[PDB]
Amino acid sequence: RDCCTPPKKCKDRQCKPQRCCA
């Protein structure tokens, strides 16, 4: 599970600012 690696996972606060989400 990763903020952007398949499967992406920007459903958190520490994985949202990630240019790969916001």
UniProtKB/Swiss-Prot annotation:
UniProt site positions, description: Important for binding sodium channel: 13
Location(s), subcellular: Secreted
Name by which UniProt lists this protein: Mu-conotoxin GIIIA
Family as reported in the entry's similarity comment: Belongs to the conotoxin M superfamily.
Domain notes: The cysteine framework is III (CC-C-C-CC).
Domain of life of the organism encoding this protein: Eukaryota
Additional information: Negative results: does not or only weakly blocks rNav1.3/SCN3A, rNav1.5/SCN5A, rNav1.7/SCN9A (IC(50)=6.0 uM and >100 uM), and rNav1.8/SCN10A.
Effect of residue 18 to K: Increase in activity on Nav channel from eel electric membranes, and important increase in binding to rat Nav1.4/SCN4A (seemingly irreversible) by potently decreasing the rates of both dissociation and association to rat Nav1.4/SCN4A channel
Tissue: Expressed by the venom duct.
